[PDB]
Write a protein that binds this ligand. Sequence first.
Ligand code: ATP
Ligand code: ATP
Ligand code: MG
Ligand code: MG
Lengths: 173, 404, 166, 141, 24, 21, 374, 283, 354
Amino acid sequence: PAYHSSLMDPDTKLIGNMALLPIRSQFKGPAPRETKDTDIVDEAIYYFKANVFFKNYEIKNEADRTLIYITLYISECLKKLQKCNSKSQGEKEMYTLGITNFPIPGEPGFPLNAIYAKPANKQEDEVMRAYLQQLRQETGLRLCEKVFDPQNDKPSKWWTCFVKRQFMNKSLS
Amino acid sequence: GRLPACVVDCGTGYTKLGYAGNTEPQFIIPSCIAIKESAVMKGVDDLDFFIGDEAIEKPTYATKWPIRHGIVEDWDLMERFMEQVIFKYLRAEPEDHYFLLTEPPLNTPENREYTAEIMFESFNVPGLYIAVQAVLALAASWTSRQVGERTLTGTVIDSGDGVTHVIPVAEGYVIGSCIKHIPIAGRDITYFIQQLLRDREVGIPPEQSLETAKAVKERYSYVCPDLVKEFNKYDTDGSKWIKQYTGINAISKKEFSIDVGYERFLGPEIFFHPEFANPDFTQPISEVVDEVIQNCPIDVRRPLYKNIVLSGGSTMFRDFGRRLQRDLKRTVDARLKLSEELSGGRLKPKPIDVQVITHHMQRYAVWFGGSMLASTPEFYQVCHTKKDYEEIGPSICRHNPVFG
Amino acid sequence: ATLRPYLSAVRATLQAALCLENFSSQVVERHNKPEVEVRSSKELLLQPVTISRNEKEKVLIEGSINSVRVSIAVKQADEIEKILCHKFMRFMMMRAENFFILRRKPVEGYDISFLITNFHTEQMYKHKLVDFVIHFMEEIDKEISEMKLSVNARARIVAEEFLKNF
Amino acid sequence: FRKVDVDEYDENKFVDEEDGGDGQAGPDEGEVDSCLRQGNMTAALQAALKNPPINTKSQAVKDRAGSIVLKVLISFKANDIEKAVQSLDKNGVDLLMKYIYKGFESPSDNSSAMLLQWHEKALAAGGVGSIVRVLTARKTV
Amino acid sequence: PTSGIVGALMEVMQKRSKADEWED
Amino acid sequence: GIVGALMEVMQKRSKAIEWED
Amino acid sequence: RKVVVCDNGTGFVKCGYAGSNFPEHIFPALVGRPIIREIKDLMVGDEASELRSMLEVNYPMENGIVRNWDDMKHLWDYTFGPEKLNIDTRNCKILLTEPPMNPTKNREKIVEVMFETYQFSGVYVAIQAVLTLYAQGLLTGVVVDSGDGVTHICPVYEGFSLPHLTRRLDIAGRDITRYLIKLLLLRGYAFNHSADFETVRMIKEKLCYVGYNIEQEQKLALETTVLVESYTLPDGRIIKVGGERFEAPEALFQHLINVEGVGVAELLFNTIQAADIDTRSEFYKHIVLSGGSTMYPGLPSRLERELKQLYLERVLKGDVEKLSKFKIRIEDPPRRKHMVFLGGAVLADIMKDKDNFWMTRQEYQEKGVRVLEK
Amino acid sequence: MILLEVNNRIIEETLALKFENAAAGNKPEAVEVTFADFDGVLYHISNPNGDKTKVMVSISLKFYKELQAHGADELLKRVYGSFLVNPESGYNVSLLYDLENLPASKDSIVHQAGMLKRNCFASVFEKYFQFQEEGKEGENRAVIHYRDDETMYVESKKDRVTVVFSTVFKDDDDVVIGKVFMQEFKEGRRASHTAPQVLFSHREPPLELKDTDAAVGDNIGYITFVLFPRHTNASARDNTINLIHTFRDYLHYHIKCSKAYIHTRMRAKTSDFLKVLNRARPD
Amino acid sequence: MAYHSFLVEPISCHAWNKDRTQIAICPNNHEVHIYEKSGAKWTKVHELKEHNGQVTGIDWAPESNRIVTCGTDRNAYVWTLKGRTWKPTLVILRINRAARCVRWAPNENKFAVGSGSRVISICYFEQENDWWVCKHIKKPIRSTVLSLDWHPNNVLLAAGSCDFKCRIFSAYIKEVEERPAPTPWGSKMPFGELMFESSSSCGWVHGVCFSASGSRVAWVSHDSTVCLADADKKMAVATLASETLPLLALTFITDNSLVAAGHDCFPVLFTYDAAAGMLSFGGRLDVPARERFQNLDKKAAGLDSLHKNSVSQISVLSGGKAKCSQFCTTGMDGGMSIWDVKSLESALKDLKIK
Ligand SMILES: Nc1ncnc2c1ncn2[C@@H]1O[C@H](COP(=O)(O)OP(=O)(O)OP(=O)(O)O)[C@@H](O)[C@H]1O
Ligand SMILES: Nc1ncnc2c1ncn2[C@@H]1O[C@H](COP(=O)(O)OP(=O)(O)OP(=O)(O)O)[C@@H](O)[C@H]1O
Ligand SMILES: [Mg+2]
Ligand SMILES: [Mg+2]
């Protein structure tokens, strides 16, 4: 069946109903440090091309809810990357796609409000907005390297062919 | 006597036909028939119909497919299809030849008997035998073990164009209570591969989109051990795995070419993850086979497990049987592992021996078995004669004494 | 020419013959049988009657308290009509499970026989059945004429299609 | 031995009666032929419907009678049958039906053609019930 | 009867036959 | 006793076998 | 009073109290042990049937005889124990039903069990082939019991049924269901003797009947389609059952399933005929049917007919005059299914406060194999 | 298909496939094929001694010895020549084709390969056509037992050439149908004044072939084709032989096909008969 | 003209409770359904499931409020309303063929069940055993019985059979009732005595009925006749041959008027002229200005009347058989219809009762 996150550490904190997994990013936000070479965003991209076909998905732990979110977002990048004319322009719009206001667990979906938990309190809410933002900005950046070919700076059809396929028939747009 | 019997396997997609004794049917034609559009018609327009390839694009004719999901829908058209099988292709004087016809497995009394009439009264055949695919595939597979054993007990995966069935068999007859079917078959894979091509490739002329999809499917796809590792090979290496096929545009006669890659392993994967192309079904084939076998009687499960025979065209992808045996000895011991972890005295019973066979005679399974049966002397002894058809009546074609 | 009056007669006879009711066997415990077939209780059989149009076409009607047996001698002008009739009655008899009222074999010396039980008159209206049998008698005569002209017609075409090529 | 039956000697089983046979007679020959030569066809009919051999078990005397009644019906015409059927009583009309159905069993010389017309007038006169009493009758012509 | 099919297939092989990244 | 009251319970099944003015 | 009753069936246990008119408890004669860890170490009757897909289940009764005395104890503990009767066995009399032609080894062991392991103050062992005659009012007569496993026969003169007058036909319910499968196989339906036994048992119960005259049922089967009936299987498929409706139960009267012997009517005739001339009369007018396999429509008529045919061509040696005189009674009351309990309930009631009837604990403690007072 | 084809499809597709693969220089494929034709013919395509490059096509007719008597070998020598070799064990005529050594135009040899039956049958016709042509009247007639219980009699005359088929109808219903078909050929020169005069007799033989172990029967019938110089001439010789020798099977083909059409009619009306019944049913 | 389709299969038989609030029917199977009326709607309140074959007779004892049923399974049950539920008591008819019809007597102390083997079963309740006993009237019956109706005195009992004749018997059971006072039918009435037997040649007898005061018996046969005998005129038999299809059910509505129904599917009136000693056909009661119009039959028949199939039973709802104002018919079309006689007399003005 589908691919789950195998980075579930004994001492992993959680925001809402998601694991607050560290990332190796240059974008500022509420993510922990990471002196390794792998993380939840690498796991999401390595797994993306497979997971996106699956409709059903059992949630083994909190780390999977973070894996799901990034997987869904990866599809939102591809929709926007499809029209771009350069790897540089893809970065302009992946910055823009991070800044874009999206819905969180609780608001009109985010069409998965059944599975995710609401970020109660004033601290859990402001941190959830910012952690999802840091995931959106770092995922968008790494995808720009992966999607664009070395010639003519156009998106590769080997990433653009996935643009119409929806993970669990859900979508952030 | 001294001219062998005719043998016809009629399937949803393809009819295989030829004479008994041979290793493979003389012809393999599409199971369609092209007729007129404006059907009260007089004259000799009934005699106006073409068959097979020469009718897959006939200008002024309507192509009709008289066989749906294994079973005959239209007997008038199946009646004419037979007329040309016998007189155009086989060129058998039908009065001089016994015939062997095949039937789906679950074809009821008011079905196989319907095809016996319109044969014994039109074509005047001296003898008829309506056989079953459950046992002919099993017989075709004995060309592998033989030194091992030769029994008619085993689980059969018949996968063709219409329907994929899982059919447990125990010493001759078919238990018709534990049969499960799967909504994944040849045409569904072709359709899903065609889909992937439209999403990605251009230059394929719309008319030849299926043609190309079939050729990609039939000519290249092969099951993989793990999905992500394969997509990884294709993104890491790429050139060493993406092959290139150039076809001819049928209208302009100039070439068109496309990249082949993601639809090599994904196409056959839908057997193991049907949800990929099927909303209403999710259960992988490995689980369906396990489930069928545990629904069967205790004392026949181990025999069924160790003789899982593959039949039909959609079982031909390379290393499809090796992946099938993994599934089963993933799941099956998993299950028994619990019988250890959930008990003490009863914890240990016997490692279930699972074996998927993979012989060279696969697409020619049912027909081959039928050709071998019709070659033997005892075939003429278990065949229903015309004399009996007339004197006893059409009831006799309802059954065939379980030989052995 | 003399078909109309003959059918009007057969109809009125059927109208009197199909006055049935459910009837438990008085011979066998908890059994229920068409008394016209088993004939084991003589008080329950009505007088057999024939209506005949001429020496070759007739109907015999055998009534009983819970079942009627209509048997038909059909017009057979010639053997091809005779072999087509036998060719067709046999065909419909093979399908007798779909005709709920059609009998497996005909009464000896007839072409086709109906066996209408009280179970048919209970689940199917009596007048429409009568209509059907009169309808049926008409249409099989039409259909044989069609088939006779059809064979003659394709015989002519097949003879010309061969000979025009010499 | 299962061929031998044990239900033929049952005392409760229904039996026959008809204890009215003290002889027989049939439609007088000369009586009918006096009406027949004269052209009085309606009188000829009323003669043949006298003293029907219902009570005799002799088949011969019933056939004798049938022949005699059939002769009257053949001698008549369709245009004059209406008047012949309107002079008989409710019981005569019911009786006429019985013979006609017996006439159908012996058809030759276009005799059935006229019989079908006789059946048509009989039916108008006596209704479907005149036919019901043919089927229902235990002692008949 | 079954013999016919068996004994026959045995004669075919006497001539017809003449012509790890996967798991544990 | 038994055969004393049991006979009356069967007589109701076995059965199978002053007017003037 | 303070009595109780118990007909231990092979399928179902029927127990109640003396003078009951229905059995106060009916439940499956079942004893299931669990395979894995409110389930207890053992389950009996209703509970055990309810969770049958989780227990390895045993029937201590095989064909009316006890095979497993261990499980039989658990089943008796359940009947008497709270969940059904909630009785102190030691302050109770109890009447049981001796199985048809049961070897006295078993007959003893139960008397031993009842007094040793439960310590009833009173016990009695009534015959199952006789108590079945007190419900219809009888003391001297024959009993044709055709059930699931076997079809027994036992005449009892003035209560006591002689040992040597009892015979068996190894054809009953299971064997007919089994045969009907074969017939539906030859009709062209791929059934299985094991897998589809239950499905075909219900087809048999629902649709099979006994032919009165075979030569006529076969003419109907062959010349008409009024015997043809649809039947919808569990999987949804519909099948046609016709002449096999009467051909299947015909095994009772006829070798049709490779079984040596004569068949119930010829057997019944031959048995009655081997008795005293005076008791022959009294047997022929005292034939009684019991058990599930006597419910086929036409059965009693067929037995009557068949006996007459024998007596005529095997009793009078070519003679019809003699035949009328042939008195004969095969009584088939409407509730043939259960009577052994009803008979035992009435007898245990009318005999409750007697003294010589109930074999006592006083008595057994003294032994002497006096378990059977003849 | 009204006219039955003359050529054998299994021979042609086997060879066309094989020859297409030789012309590409592909590896020579192994082959073993046992199949039939009408009139009890048995073919066999194979590789002699396992030699894949060589493809032998053999044919076996039980009445070849009779055709041989009327110049079969010399006709086959013309047509195939180099290709014709000694007959395989059990068969009468064998062709051998070397895949290493084939013609440019592949279509010519393949067409003649598919006509191995037919040439067989045009030896007796060629002869009697020229008996008539040269005027050699009063020769022996030929008797070909093309089926076990059927016989063809060929006979040359002053002005005409007669061909008599003595054919049998197993099914008794086929006698009556066949009769209707034969009756047509009787009034057949309405179409062509030039037409083969076609005579028919139901049981006993015609005046022409009197006695000579005649086979009278209720299920026999004698069809006589009176061919003339027009249809016999070299220009129209091969066409005439192609039609005339398929005639028996053309007749029986069309009887059976006629009955199959009767079926589709009977399905229609039968289907229309259960609609009326069904309407009586009140929901 | 008050038709209600309870179902589409037959209603085999029916019975009404005392005050006609509830109707019991057998919907052509082994069960009996009881429907109570609620405002406009009929509502099913009870199912009586005990028979193991088709139920052929149902009768409701008005004062004791007890239903008796009889069926092809050879059995009969007396149903007793206990609280919210009808509970059945098996009656040993001891008959070896199917039961065919059952009618309580007026006095409600006994019922007469029809058998399927040349016999009438007379059942009474035995108070000491709490048990239904039944005695058989055998000779000279020789065919299956087919309808019953009691004389008002609860002793004389009419029966129609397959034997071609209507008979009057004495069903006098000394252990439950006073001696009967003599009747025009006779003075000697021991159990089983044959008081009268019809003379008719042939014909089956589908329904029979006594007059209100019990002097006259009327019956209908399968030869499309209706007959009547009055004991006042030395049991003289009035006969009438119908032009139409047989009648299956009959009842007196006055002392000299009859309503009958059968295979034509509509009720018909017969008057008896005492003086001239002849039965007379009073005509069609079920009549289709509007209906005379197009009357297009929505393709779903074309026939008229209240029933679309034979009427099998007819019963007096009020006024008894002396002055019947309302009567009920059930038929093989699964219909139950209700008619009024004053309304019928308004519609058909040229219609004369008595
Ligand atoms: N080389 C190949 N690889 C994969 N699939 C193939 C290949 N060749 C043919 N097929 C598929 O095999 C299927 C047809 O096989 P087959 O003729 O055995 O089925 P059928 O008999 O028509 O139907 P069924 O057996 O289900 O009644 C088609 O779907 C076709 O695409
Ligand atoms: N309606 C029916 N018709 C025919 N047979 C039936 C019917 N119902 C049950 N049976 C059969 O009767 C048998 C069950 O009867 P019963 O329960 O009396 O037997 P038992 O008490 O278990 O065995 P035994 O009487 O031998 O101790 C089964 O074999 C079953 O197939
Ligand atoms: Mg197939
Ligand atoms: Mg028991």
